[PDB]
Amino acid sequence: PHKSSLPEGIRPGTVLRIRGLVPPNASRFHVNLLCGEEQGSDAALHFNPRLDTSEVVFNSKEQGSWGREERGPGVPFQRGQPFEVLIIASDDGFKAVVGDAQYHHFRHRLPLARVRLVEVGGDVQLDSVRIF
Amino acid sequence: SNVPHKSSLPEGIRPGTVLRIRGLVPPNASRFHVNLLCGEEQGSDAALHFNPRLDTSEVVFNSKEQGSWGREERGPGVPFQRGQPFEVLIIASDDGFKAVVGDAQYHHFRHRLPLARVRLVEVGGDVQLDSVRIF
Ligand SMILES: CC(=O)N[C@@H]1[C@@H](O)[C@H](O[C@@H]2O[C@H](CO)[C@H](O)[C@H](O)[C@H]2O)[C@@H](CO)O[C@@H]1O
Numbered sequence: 001p002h003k004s005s006l007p008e009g010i011r012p013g014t015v016l017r018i019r020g021l022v023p024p025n026a027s028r029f030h031v032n033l034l035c036g037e038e039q040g041s042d043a044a045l046h047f048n049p050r051l052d053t054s055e056v057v058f059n060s061k062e063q064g065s066w067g068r069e070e071r072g073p074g075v076p077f078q079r080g081q082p083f084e085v086l087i088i089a090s091d092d093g094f095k096a097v098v099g100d101a102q103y104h105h106f107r108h109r110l111p112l113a114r115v116r117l118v119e120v121g122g123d124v125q126l127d128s129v130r131i132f
Numbered sequence: 133s134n135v136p137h138k139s140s141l142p143e144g145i146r147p148g149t150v151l152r153i154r155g156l157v158p159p160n161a162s163r164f165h166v167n168l169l170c171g172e173e174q175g176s177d178a179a180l181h182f183n184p185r186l187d188t189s190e191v192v193f194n195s196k197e198q199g200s201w202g203r204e205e206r207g208p209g210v211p212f213q214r215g216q217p218f219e220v221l222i223i224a225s226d227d228g229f230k231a232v233v234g235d236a237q238y239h240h241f242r243h244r245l246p247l248a249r250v251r252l253v254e255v256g257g258d259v260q261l262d263s264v265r266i267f
Contacts, residue, residue, distance in 0.1 A: 013225025
């Protein structure tokens with residue numbers, strides 16, 4: 001479960017670039033933007049490609065409980081295929097771009113200034129996470 | 133080549149807008165530019181003029197306001213090369229445009245004109261464009 005702090009935190013204009021590869025037998029994976037390093041922290045953003053149920057869920061987790069989930073249109077991920085995801089924080093939400101195409105917009109539920117680290121986990125071969 | 137390349141931005145741009153430009157600098161390139169213009173008229177104001185000069189080995193950033201060019205800012209060295217491809221990310225943030233060349237932070241240009249005035253992206257000069265995407 002990859003983890004990495006966001007030194008200056010994240011703000012409108014912060015881009016997260018995740019490059020990786022979906023393992024040949026992957027079932028699903030996720031990227032979480034957490035507000036604390038404590039286990040079970042509020043997730044300002046939970047991005048979850050599910051190669052098995054063929055859907056991509058976006059969601060929040062606050063004070064311990066999940067929230068209203070949103071689903072993207074289709075799964076822009078292929079097993080055994082490499083990918084590149086851009087997560088862009090704008091003044092009003094996170095834009096999820098998957099290889100040259102805007103995929104989904106997620107409106108902020110917790111305040112951007114509460115996000116402190118990225119966590120990438122699940123069935124994924126993570127090559128690199130870069131914050132711009 | 134696909135230059136000059138012009139892309140309209142009807143609703144303008146805001147903090148969190150990303151411009152990704154990929155292309156090849158050709159063998160005899162002198163220089164090329166990426167402008168964030170305020171109108172489609174010739175000589176329009178420019179919130180951002182990004183100008184890699186392969187012929188003088190400098191990378192210049194400027195703005196044009198009221199038909200008047202501002203004070204040029206120079207980035208740290210030339211991270212471009214004739215006969216070599218490139219990828220540039222111009223990210224609009226709360227206080228400036230972040231220029232990322234070749235996977236590394238290259239220069240930060242503090243805003244000079246209000247972001248709400250940008251209405252066009254133009255790419256031209258000695259460059260052979262692969263793609264310009266705006267996210
Ligand atoms: C159709 C539907 O409502 N499905 C939901 C599932 O999304 C949900 O699964 C969990 O979802 C969270 C994010 O919402 C995490 O991805 C977690 O890993 C999943 O187990 C389940 C459980 O809440 O409820 C329905 O099945």
